[PDB]
């Protein structure tokens, strides 16, 4: 499986802390600064906007900090559908796992897994064309935030979840966590991610060439 | 074929004007970050650098300065560059030290340019014998907002031919931006890579870093 792109296509990137990135919530125009943030989505869309220029691809960013899957589902008519997005990316997990720790969550990983299930239903429902690309919630061990006793194997759960849905719903998986398994023989965890959740200008530029290779679009 | 050799912990430094500069933080005195950086075709190149090469952990820093000519790179090349012992010095200039002859009224011609540039390599040289320098093609998308055809070319490809010279005098790299537009525009409009056809938009950042890891060879 591979993406496949139109002309004028309109690409969407979904999620949370990580997708966001300080991204202007004001910005209405897409291929900006403004409109992407700083995070993996600008490295992803750059890519796409050289790589695939040809086809002068639209490309937004609707990803909010602090987001679950129950948080998307509360805005994904405005920040999802009204985009009629030809290519939607979804980068969500961390959080619904996280929160049970920081905010105390009652959300469990059948919460997680029924959630998002719920709402690619939906979203293949309401959009039947648009393509998904659903990618891996990870982690970095030797980050800040993670407490090895409090995270695994866990969180892994979480991972296997993202992945079983993705074959369910045949969409392109992005395999981070293997990628970020293998970026850690090469430097600290701390040079790719200081807190373990939240990559730094390595990581982003990291998970970007991972997301292109995945969907095949080079 | 001739490559850029990086060691562990080597100091990558970029230098230049508004396209270098790129709206960086000219307060920042760390290393491989956004404020560092800033938003041009050097954030773009430097991520590739620091996710490519991480087992080398570089430290990329960007000197740029925007409506800088040459002469102007010479007056803070203390401070803005010897000091930082770069293993891997950028160099992108020549644009301005054409376009302000148009703008503000600059009487330097490219003799001026070509003398000024070979100047500067020489010292470089000259205090860190060591550097690896990676010099850039100056460039223009013809179809920008700023670009007047009548009043920019062929005299503009003089400062293109200077600036391969003086790579082959200095036996540098050369990253050739020109060939790499004038092939692009073939894709897509100019207005979509740059919109005033002098500073690059980010499809043009992307394309400038892709072919400065290529003519640098690091992948």
């Given at each position: 499986?591979?993406?496949?792109?139109?002309?004028?296509?309109?690409?969407?990137?979904?999620?949370?802390?990580?997708?966001?990135?300080?991204?202007?919530?004001?910005?209405?125009?897409?291929?900006?600064?403004?409109?992407?943030?700083?995070?993996?989505?600008?490295?992803?869309?750059?890519?796409?906007?050289?790589?695939?220029?040809?086809?002068?691809?639209?490309?937004?960013?609707?990803?909010?900090?602090?987001?679950?899957?129950?948080?998307?589902?509360?805005?994904?008519?405005?920040?999802?559908?009204?985009?009629?997005?030809?290519?939607?990316?979804?980068?969500?997990?961390?959080?619904?796992?996280?929160?049970?720790?920081?905010?105390?969550?009652?959300?469990?990983?059948?919460?997680?897994?029924?959630?998002?299930?719920?709402?690619?239903?939906?979203?293949?429902?309401?959009?039947?064309?648009?393509?998904?690309?659903?990618?891996?919630?990870?982690?970095?061990?030797?980050?800040?935030?993670?407490?090895?006793?409090?995270?695994?194997?866990?969180?892994?759960?979480?991972?296997?979840?993202?992945?079983?849905?993705?074959?369910?719903?045949?969409?392109?998986?992005?395999?981070?966590q293997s990628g970020f398994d293998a970026a850690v023989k090469?430097?600290?965890?701390?040079?790719?991610?200081?807190?373990?959740?939240?990559?730094?200008?390595?990581?982003?530029?990291?998970?970007?060439?991972?997301?292109?290779?995945?969907?095949?679009?080079?």
């Amino acid at each position: 499986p591979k993406i496949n792109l139109k002309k004028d296509c309109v690409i969407l990137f979904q999620g949370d802390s990580i997708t966001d990135c300080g991204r202007d919530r004001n910005s209405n125009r897409c291929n900006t600064m403004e409109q992407f943030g700083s995070g993996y989505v600008l490295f992803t869309a750059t890519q796409l906007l050289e790589g695939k220029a040809a086809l002068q691809p639209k490309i937004y960013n609707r990803g909010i900090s602090g987001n679950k899957v129950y948080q998307l589902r509360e805005r994904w008519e405005i920040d999802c559908l009204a985009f009629q997005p030809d290519v939607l990316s979804i980068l969500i997990g961390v959080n619904d796992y996280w929160h049970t720790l920081t905010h105390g969550y009652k959300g469990t990983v059948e919460t997680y897994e029924n959630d998002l299930r719920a709402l690619l239903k939906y979203t293949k429902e309401k959009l039947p064309n648009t393509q998904i690309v659903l990618c891996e919630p990870f982690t970095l061990r030797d980050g800040a935030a993670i407490e090895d006793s409090k995270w695994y194997p866990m969180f892994d759960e979480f991972r296997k979840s993202a992945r079983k849905l993705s074959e369910e719903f045949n969409t392109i998986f992005v395999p981070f966590q293997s990628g970020f398994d293998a970026a850690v023989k090469l430097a600290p965890a701390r040079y790719w991610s200081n807190d373990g959740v939240h990559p730094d200008l390595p990581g982003r530029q990291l998970m970007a060439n991972m997301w292109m290779e995945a969907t095949g679009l080079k």
